[PDB]
Amino acid sequence: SGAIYVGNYRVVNRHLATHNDWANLVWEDSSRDLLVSSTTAQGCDTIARCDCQTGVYYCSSRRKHYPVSFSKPSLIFVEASEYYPARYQSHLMLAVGHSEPGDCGGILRCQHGVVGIVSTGGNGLVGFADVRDLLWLD
Ligand SMILES: CSc1ccncc1NC(=O)N1CCC[C@H](C(N)=O)C1
Ligand SMILES: [Zn+2]
Numbered sequence: 001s002g003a004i005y006v007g008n009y010r011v012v013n014r015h016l017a018t019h020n021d022w023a024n025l026v027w028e029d030s031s032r033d034l035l036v037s038s039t040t041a042q043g044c045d046t047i048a049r050c051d052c053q054t055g056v057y058y059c060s061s062r063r064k065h066y067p068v069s070f071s072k073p074s075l076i077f078v079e080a081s082e083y084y085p086a087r088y089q090s091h092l093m094l095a096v097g098h099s100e101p102g103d104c105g106g107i108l109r110c111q112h113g114v115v116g117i118v119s120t121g122g123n124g125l126v127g128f129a130d131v132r133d134l135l136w137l138d
Contacts, residue, residue, distance in 0.1 A: 001016060001060070001102065001104070001105045001118060002058070002060070002104070002105025002107060002118075003105060003108050003117075004043075004045050004047075004107065004114050004117065004131065004137070005039065005043030005044050005045050006043045006044050006045045006046065006047055006068050006114075006137050007137065007138065008038055008039050008040070008041075008043070009026060009036050009037070009043065009044065009137055010036065010037045010038075010039050010043070011034065011036050011117065011131060011137070012032055012034075012035050012037070012105065012117075013033050013034070013104045013117060013118075013129070014029070014030060014032075014033050014041075014117055015027055015033060015036040015084070015104070016081070016082075016104060016105060017035040019138060020037070021035055021037040022035075023038075024037040024038045024039075025037055025067055026038055026080070028072075029039065029087070030084070030088065030089070031089060031090045031106040032090055032091045032092075032129055033084075033089060033118070033119045033120075033129050034129055034131070035052065036134075036137070044112070045102065045104040045107075046060035046086075046113040046114065046115060046131065047111055047113050047114050047131060047134070047137050048055065048109070048110050048113035048132055049112065049113075049117050049132060049135075050112045050115075051072075052110035052112065052115065053069060053070055053072065053112070054067070054068065054069050054070070054072070054110065055067075055068060055070070055097075055108050055109055055110040055115050056068070056108070056109055057097065057106055057107065057108040057109075057126065057128065058089060058107055059097070059098055059099065059103055059106060059118075060102060060105075060112075060128075061098065061099075061102060061103050062098060066097050066098070067094060068095040068096070068097050068108070068126070070093040070094060070095035070108070070128060071093050071095070072093065072131070073090075073091040073092065073093055073130040074091075074092060074093075075088045075089070075090050075092075076089055076092045076094065076120075078120055078130075079090075082112050083089075086130065089119070089120065089127075089129075090129070091128055091129060091130045091133065092118050092119065092120065092121075092129060092130070093108075093115075093116065093125050093127065093128045094112060094125055094126070094128075095125070095126050095127075095128070096124055096125060096126075097124070097125070097126040098124065098126065099118055099121030099122075099125070099126035099127075100121070101121075103118050103121065103126070104117070104118050104119055105118060106118040107115055108128045110129065114131065115128065115130065115132060116128040116129050116130045116131050116132070117124035117129055117131070119137070120134050
């Protein structure tokens with residue numbers, strides 16, 4: 001679990017969005033596993049606008065942060081799950097690092113701000129949904 005809070009927006013994994021997120025929907029994209037909902041309170045986070053390929057992510061299954069080198073956002077094949085059929089997920093960045101399903105929502109940050117959130121993983125890999133291209137979040 002986990003979310004980014006920026007301005008009057010809450011960014012979550014689309015497969016983990018709540019009834020309240022869908023009732024206050026701003027934008028969603030199943031191909032990116034992202035959903036953004038509106039909030040009444042001002043958010044605590046700021047978004048990176050950069051081309052960093054290194055950063056640090058929070059891993060809830062280890063209660064720890066880990067450093068990572070990650071690929072540029074791209075179209076990656078993701079196997080079927082209880083949430084989606086087998087498909088290509090877009091704007092996804094992969095890295096070597098531990099992750100389990102419940103780790104989705106952990107933030108990846110570089111020195112400039114929030115880069116994205118954990119969205120996929122397996123066998124020593126972790127994948128992050130990029131948010132740096134969503135200029136309207138600011
Ligand atoms: C950190 S998620 C993870 C980690 C380790 N084994 C497996 C997984 N699970 C996954 O990758 N998925 C299940 C939830 C929906 C994800 C999607 N973005 O399509 C795919
Ligand atoms: Zn950066």
